[model samples]
Target: SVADTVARVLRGCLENMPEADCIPKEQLSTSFQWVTKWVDYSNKYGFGYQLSDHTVGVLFNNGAHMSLLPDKKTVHYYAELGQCSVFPATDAPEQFISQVTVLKYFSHYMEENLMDGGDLPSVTDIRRPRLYLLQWLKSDKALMMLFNDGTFQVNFYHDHTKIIICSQNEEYLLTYINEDRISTTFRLTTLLMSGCSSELKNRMEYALNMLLQ
Candidate 1:
């Protein structure tokens, strides 16, 4: 779902490489939420995390995405892109019972063991589309996650910093989460004008290349 959005951002960056004046600041007021914290147990299970809205999700080794809503009683299961099923967590389908259990376990573990990744506000707009893992990759340097809504996130394992890019109100925003877990958000247009640290630029380039590949 975010494939097109990512491509458009990349294209815009490429087209304006020689000048920052071409970028626009329209729709700059909206903010996109991202996964605030996550834990990887890919050695035995899938990746697990808590989003800014407190929704817990897991992208399993079996390639299924399961999530517990903020209410903690409703479960949303996604077996394929653009398809989702909703049911009570206490009454999941027989085939999904084990995954439901795993989802609850992941939820509990994150609540007790981890901290929120940043200070981004939680999602309050009910009309906003729900997100589920679309693709994920692990490398020696970092772990990258792509969500169905076109949210892209990369977590650097060594430095504990992270980068998240997403579209909001038709504009693209990038968030940088520092090792202290504090976060700073920037508009792509603003970044073009003000520039960014080499460290941030390098990782952004890596993420873009990964998406391209």
Candidate 2:
């Protein structure tokens, strides 16, 4: 009951935020709005942890996206509300529903200190730059996503799958031809060192399959 209630309360806070502050920074210059019906999505598959006035961490659809939080406030404001920055991590669902998955469930230098109701640190932490896993339903391609976090990565999967990784740096599209530089052993090795356990792997697989199907 506490968890459910917390989600609702957080959703309320999120909804009440100014639309201008909640959007991507690049859109600030334009008359942009989420006019397609903004829903009370707190209970949905994703999770949103308020980071600051201009930043928030979101877990959705087997992936995570660092978002903007309207009306920035000081640490004191949040702590007074029975909330603190936190590291929130969750088990990856087999059939990926949102951007929550085997993506790196690691720690961050600044993100670790945030807290609230003493929830799961990984899930709560917004400081760490995490990755999002998505696949194009029309094709067998996999998408490795992010918001403002900078780029770094390689690819996996079959049928000349493309890898689109973006960040503050240049965005890259790893095409079928880009697959030539590595051996199968190297790919498996990357996953091994990725800090992803069986549970994380299973969760990611489900999301990946959902995309392919």
Candidate 3:
């Protein structure tokens, strides 16, 4: 899923030079939904969020990711990219008790308070692969998340806007969610041809710089 999408995008980026942009033109039939609401409790815990698939996840202060599956009973813990373990919410290992408690708290809080960031469809396949936070960074302007599968998202703090880049059906698409939480998606090649708003372009540039780092 995300991993495949990202691999393709990065490969394309490397193959094409400055003369020709690497973004592909084909559009996929489905859209991938990303995190809609997030809480930055970095001072104590870390970052928490709710994905479109109804899964709740938190990147703890210790740099580990813990996700409560859609069932809210199954838990997936990631020590780092590609390293994951499963546990039951009720019986978390002794070492993870505190983090597990915080995760549930974040899940309940987001469930009651925030709204979905966009109207994108959720992944319904039971066999669809799980997505976990891979890396996150906080900057003066925004917050960024990179998932294990290569889905990259940036959320601007001041304007409440967001940018999500992911692959779907073998093609890449970029989605922009504005202040009103309205979303507009375009194929990467489409953006290369027609260009995008200065606001969006600026964010994209910032995201690229972050990726570089």
Worst ten in a row by lDDT for model 3: 14-23
- For candidate 1, lDDT tens digit of each residue in 1-213? 467678678556644544333223332334455887788887887889888778889999878898898899999888845467899999888999988998988898888888877666777753566888878887888888888788899888887888888877677788777778867777887776556566767767777767765
Q: Give each model a TM-score.
A: 0.85, 0.21, 0.82
Please list the residue runs of candidate 1 whose C-alpha ends up more than 4 Å from where it truly belongs after superposition: 14-31, 80-83
Write candidate 2's Cα lDDT for 181-200 as tens digits.
31111122223223233432
lDDT (C-alpha, whole model) for all candidates: 0.77, 0.27, 0.77
Worst 10 residues of 2 by lDDT: 28-37
lDDT of 3 by residue, 61-110 (tens): 88789999889999998885447789999999998898899999999899
Q: Which pairs clash in model 3?
A: 2-149, 3-149
What are the per-model C-alpha RMSD values against the true structure? 3.7, 19.7, 4.6
Question: Candidate 2: misplaced stretches above 4 Å?
Answer: 1-58, 61-84, 87-140, 150-157, 160-213
Q: How close is candidate 2 to the true structure, as a TM-score?
A: 0.21
Cα distance off (Å), candidate 3, residue 56? 0.7
Against the correct fold, how does model 1 do in TM-score? 0.85
Question: Model 1, residue 202: displacement in angstroms?
Answer: 1.4
